[PDB]
């Protein structure tokens with residue numbers, strides 16, 4: 001049909017269409033005013049691919065390798081040692097905090113614009129080792145359809161990710177239709193100064209915020225100032241975001257992207273170092289969280305090139 | 306004329322109309338794509354009245370008075386002593402940091418929703434000691450017109466204030482047409498938990514962010530992810546915000562609300578404990594900042610009741 005053409009008939013497609021209709025039709029008992037139609041998405045594993053590692057970790061790896069010729073101490077200092085020796089099991093222990101700390105330690109003292117240029121150049125030159133396309137083409141076509149569908153019904157679509165806010169902001173508008181003011185992520189602190197008479201923001205070697213696990217409802221409440229009426233995630237790091245939206249007196253809709261398709265994408269859940277999905281999957285039924293089976297529910301995974 | 310009906314012919318009205326036309330007309334050399342049309346306003350002294358004190362300070366005063374029966378130590382502990390003894394000169398030393406610390410110390414341990422209810426009840430019951438109307442009716446009608454005019458031309462209007470984000474969010478949408486996700490302010494840290502099975506955010510006795518002076522470009526860059534193309538302020542605390550927008554290679558528009566009208570509002574600048582305007586006023590000409598003379602440039606100050 002017209003809406004969600006890459007989605008087969010499934011629990012998830014039925015729930016999405018029913019819910020959006022119910023909250024946007026004047027006179028419906030569940031009608032939500034346009035201004036309150038906030039929906040939050042994780043990025044890694046929800047909107048795009050996160051195997052064999054988080055894309056920002058791939059970026060951090062290349063950056064460390066490029067910088068390593070000035071750092072004899074990195075042959076022994078963690079996590080740089082793991083990065084240099086290509087030790088993927090060690091790197092899986094970083095999490096959101098470790099990933100932003102690694103990025104923080106390697107890009108302090110430069111401006112926001114300098115960092116953006118670095119990210120932009122990397123994300124157009126690097127490619128996925130499996131798909132041999134830019135990482136920004138390893139986005140999920142069915143989720144692009146979902147984003148458009150929601151925006152057509154006057155939802156504001158936000159990203160709420162553990163990844164670095166400034167890693168996603170350079171390309172999220174072009175790729176997802178999501179502007180920088182609707183991207184929430186982990187961050188370092190900034191300092192204002194003038195350089196050559198030019199006002200700039202400079203990155204500090206200090207953490208500002210880690211937007212994962214119980215951090216997600218905090219990031220949402222601080223930045224958006226509203227409880228979202230819908231949320232989509234894929235891992236146990238999304239548990240609190242989904243709960244905040246769906247549980248107690250709130251009656252919002254939560255969905256989980258379940259990676260079940262080893263042929264067209266990757267199959268993983270409870271054992272995965274990246275995007276581990278276990279506790280949230282077990283509790284889905286009791287919470288009313290609707291699970292998207294990628295293998296069965298999506299007609300295509302990625303957009304045509 | 307149709308646009309800005311409460312604005313007389315003035316440098317400010319000419320600059321606003323010219324600039325908005327220039328950046329929103331297809332084919333103009335200064336055309337700014339719709340997605341980039343970000344404008345930032347201070348609140349206190351820019352959108353509404355801040356004499357005889359910041360409205361949030363009035364709120365904090367009432368809250369301290371209500372709570373004082375449980376705090377024998379407040380007879381000696383500052384700033385509570387000053388609040389109790391009605392010592393306005395001492396209270397003028399607080400600034401944005403002190404104001405948020407005072408609010409932080411008196412509302413820790415309650416939920417975001419509990420705090421919102423407290424603010425909402427106060428702001429509808431309290432009244433300005435001069436105008437004898439709710440503080441939310443002591444907003445500037447010409448600025449309401451400016452906000453509408455900008456939104457009609459597809460600008461996104463943000464507040465960027467030193468005051469508490471959660472003090473403004475309960476009423477800013479109704480009063481200014483600005484939703485919570487477009488309010489930037491000072492804040493305390495939050496913690497996620499469940500209370501009676503209900504997911505909530507709880508206020509901590511810990512500062513998160515102070516959004517004043519050189520903090521304003523930081524708050525803007527972190528939350529919005531964009532340099533605004535226009536900004537309006539009124540005090541020296543807005544200097545960095547205006548500079549960030551107008552100076553160096555950026556060529557945005559900055560305006561300053563100058564309180565020159567003692568008859569219809571308040572007259573103050575260089576000597577005022579609240580909304581002190583001195584360094585920014587002296588530098589306005591050199592920066593290209595356009596000064597709004599309230600006495601001469603505005604046909605009315607407040608909306609009709």
Ligand SMILES: [Ca+2]
Pocket residue numbers: 042043044045046233234235237275
């Ligand atoms: Ca994820």
Ligand SMILES: [Ca+2]
Pocket residue numbers: 347348349350351538539540542580
């Ligand atoms: Ca001000």
